[PDB]
Design an enzyme around this catalytic site. Structure first.
Site, PDB file in Angstrom:
ATOM      1  N   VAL A 145      40.259  42.230  45.900  1.00  0.00           N
ATOM      2  CA  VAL A 145      40.022  42.851  44.589  1.00  0.00           C
ATOM      3  C   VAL A 145      39.265  44.169  44.737  1.00  0.00           C
ATOM      4  CG1 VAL A 145      39.096  42.663  42.271  1.00  0.00           C
ATOM      5  CG2 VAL A 145      40.153  40.674  43.348  1.00  0.00           C
ATOM      6  N   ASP A 177      30.258  46.482  51.644  1.00  0.00           N
ATOM      7  CA  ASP A 177      30.589  45.080  51.875  1.00  0.00           C
ATOM      8  C   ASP A 177      29.420  44.458  52.615  1.00  0.00           C
ATOM      9  OD1 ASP A 177      32.235  42.554  52.080  1.00  0.00           O
ATOM     10  OD2 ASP A 177      33.883  43.858  51.494  1.00  0.00           O
ATOM     11  N   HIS A 219      54.158  30.175  37.118  1.00  0.00           N
ATOM     12  CA  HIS A 219      53.644  30.919  38.275  1.00  0.00           C
ATOM     13  C   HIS A 219      54.538  30.770  39.489  1.00  0.00           C
ATOM     14  CE1 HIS A 219      49.810  30.936  36.031  1.00  0.00           C
ATOM     15  NE2 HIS A 219      49.497  31.974  36.788  1.00  0.00           N
ATOM     16  N   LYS A 243      51.101  28.779  44.437  1.00  0.00           N
ATOM     17  CA  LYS A 243      49.848  28.532  43.745  1.00  0.00           C
ATOM     18  C   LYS A 243      49.350  27.087  43.915  1.00  0.00           C
ATOM     19  CE  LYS A 243      47.496  29.217  39.421  1.00  0.00           C
ATOM     20  NZ  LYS A 243      46.434  30.103  39.937  1.00  0.00           N
TER      21      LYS A 243
HETATM   22 CL   LIG Z   1      44.176  31.734  37.178  1.00  0.00          CL
HETATM   23 CL   LIG Z   2      47.418  32.399  42.717  1.00  0.00          CL
END
Ligand SMILES: [Cl-]
Ligand SMILES: [Cl-]
Ligand SMILES: [Cl-]
Ligand SMILES: [Cl-]
Ligand SMILES: [Cl-]
Ligand SMILES: [Cl-]
Ligand code: NA
Ligand code: NA
Ligand code: NA
Ligand code: NA
EC number: 1.17.1.8
Lengths: 247, 249, 247, 249
Positions: free
Chosen positions: C14, C35, C134, C138
């Protein structure tokens, strides 16, 4: 053991994708990757069995003449095929009856099935319309695929009354573009890729066929399917659909 | 000299399906209603009035008796009644050997849209890595998932034999989140006020998806398929199972 | 002139995305990219005004203590915020009343609006269900977002009769997962990314709210919106929704 | 001692909307139908029977006369009749100064789902690069696009003022492909047998989309919103325009 596959137009955007996919496939061996400047004798020098050709309309005929003369099967995504060009390809193939050439406007399996389904459904409903939705960088409205789909639908609806419509008052464009009596609506929206919905309706029910592409490389599995199966049909095949072997 | 219409009788005429078909036959210009029978009415009324074809949505307990009479009398039959075992189909076949001109059609679904959807699902199923069914109905429905969804998932599974199963990395879940498993095909059943009968079949491979959706907004959406079967039933001698052959796909 | 923005956890997935987005934005100047290993004094050494923090729950509290003490606003996507942690953040902020901290579980503007809309609609319909779809890599079913959405819906439906359902016979799992009386169905299909539909119904009509994410980086515009607007609300804000300024 | 219900009259009771509302008022346990009037019936019937609130879906030519009487008599009014110009709204406001306890609600849409959709579209519109409307209706509809779609597109445009217009690289097209332009917002009108009244508002920015869809499967789907307005109309003295305030959003 693996099938020897060459790619023509290998530095083009489609070609370069197909080069990667051929390399990744376990059962296919990349035997050539040619672009403008490279002699076609490289195909025969390296025992290429089948080629993928997404070149340019100005060169494809030269490619095909060589390929056919050498018994090299061809999976062709290049456009610009007039009736005179298809005829020339057919004549070349008379001399080489075990060679196969496939020329197709669409290789995405989902888009091919969707067009076939639309064709089968079209005569059984009072109304038919096409909605296509694409990213807002697209130059043409409606898309090639939507226009071809609406034409198939129209053709299959021969003899039927036109779509019922009581519209008496409207803003210009509200009812979409008329492609052979079939409305085609073109949505251009940031966040989208390439999407198409075909809608069919009669009093009491509706049937919708929707195809979504989430990535520009979603045709890859159909090209590879054409490569693996191209020798099953000798001669010229137009469109991917016959290869799918729909009972 | 213009021929009068095809003479059509309806059995189970006071049932919900029958009564609808009575009205549709009366409205159709090429069809003449020649009988409207319910339990208590003798079948001889069909032959007394020169009925050529009947529509039968009666009850599994009576349909075999109806069919024996109909076939013996050379009266074609369009049958929507369920409960047809292999033994029953075989009995119908043997009755027909003696009456080769007669045609019988037995079909579990007459909605043209539902028939096409199932056919499309069957054709698409082997070409994608993943397949799932979502069905959505009014919240007065007793069964989850619906008959049509279960049959659709079974067709899909059958057509996918010798493919790898649906990919799924699910390692943690609330119970029921992944739907009902019908022959390796997830089936999700939505029950929502404001809905009638709706089904979506979803197919996917990395990069693309294909969705086939059938919506029925009214309980009488089967009518055009029954009428099609009536008009065309005589084109095929003997027994036909399912509406799909009549569509000429 | 441009706002000085630092990113903590800059080598995470991210963080690295947010680094690129900050660099691309004309009105934002990247003033730090830290970091694990980097001292936080680099933030004050380079006059950082606001940070984006998607680090790890084990470090975020240390980060926040420093940030608040130095009057550096914080846009926080890190999870693991217990009631005790939120309380600690609140106390730190008493001493620094012009500093702003935003902690949000979801930054995709479309997902945030979708949850707010679901909350507003929920009490006005007899039935409510959630369908999420999804990619099939996942791990969790249903998703975090779907579960949070179903909880909001349930909460807003306080006092209402439960969803009507005549189901008497079923295969196990057909009716989905029950999250506080709200069915949640989890579809896992190759070709999908992250998609969610909330359905509402009463006899005669239905209302559907659907959010589609076609790319894993679709949250970026909401994080940047939070960065640009974070100083409008002094103190602690939980969730992105208040920032959207919905009248 | 339990209070009898609120006394509700319906004007235009033999019209399609009125007749539906008559049935719904009779069915509701907390509401007592105190009058059902159509053209020819004197309005004094409302006061003779102690009507407290009326539902009015009459005709633009009569509604002002109705409202003058209702307000003069302190009878609350829930009004679905159209044709309300700024001059008409002003006239209603001035009548109400003399009768401060009285409440009037005038709303162009009573379907709760349609009201929420428009509200949601208005809230979402400024947060996305692109916005488009698709509406889908039965093929007996005279106007394209619908009133509701046109109003929705206008709200969206208004909420997007001072944003860049929708991005669009279209350089080549068949006429009509990009829909009708309503204040910079494309509106596409589908007309298909089997549909009733359906609307989708689509919003997008690179990476994501948000879709709000309203489906009406039956012409009587407005009933719950009219009843809501009747039950709650007295909470706000004076004139309220639109159902949205009553939802308490
Ligand atoms: Cl989520
Ligand atoms: Cl995911
Ligand atoms: Cl393009
Ligand atoms: Cl195209
Ligand atoms: Cl069923
Ligand atoms: Cl309208
Ligand atoms: Na390879
Ligand atoms: Na007739
Ligand atoms: Na920058
Ligand atoms: Na009552």
């Amino acid at each position: 053991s693996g099938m020897r596959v060459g790619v023509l137009g290998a530095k083009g955007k489609v070609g370069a994708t197909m080069v990667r996919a051929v390399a990744a496939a376990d059962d296919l061996t990349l035997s050539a990757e040619l672009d403008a400047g490279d002699p076609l004798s490289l195909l025969t020098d390296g025992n290429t069995e089948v080629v993928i050709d997404f070149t340019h309309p100005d060169v494809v005929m030269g490619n095909l003449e060589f390929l056919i003369d050498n018994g090299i099967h061809a999976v062709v995504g290049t456009t610009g095929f007039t009736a005179e060009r298809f005829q020339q390809v057919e004549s070349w193939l008379v001399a080489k009856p075990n060679t196969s050439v496939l020329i197709a406007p669409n290789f995405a399996i989902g888009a091919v099935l969707s067009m076939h389904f639309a064709k089968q459904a079209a005569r059984f409903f009072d109304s038919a319309e096409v909605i296509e939705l694409h990213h807002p960088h697209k130059a043409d409205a409606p898309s090639g695929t939507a226009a071809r789909t609406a034409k198939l639908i129209a053709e299959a609806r021969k003899g039927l009354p036109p779509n019922p419509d009581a519209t008496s008052t409207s803003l210009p464009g509200a009812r979409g573009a008329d492609v052979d009596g079939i409305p085609v609506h073109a949505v251009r929206l940031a966040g989208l890729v390439a999407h198409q919905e075909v809608l069919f309706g009669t009093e009491g029910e509706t049937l919708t066929i929707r195809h979504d592409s989430l990535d520009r490389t979603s045709f890859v599995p159909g090209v590879l399917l054409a490569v693996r199966r191209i020798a099953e049909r000798p001669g010229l095949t137009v469109g991917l659909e016959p290869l799918l072997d729909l009972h």
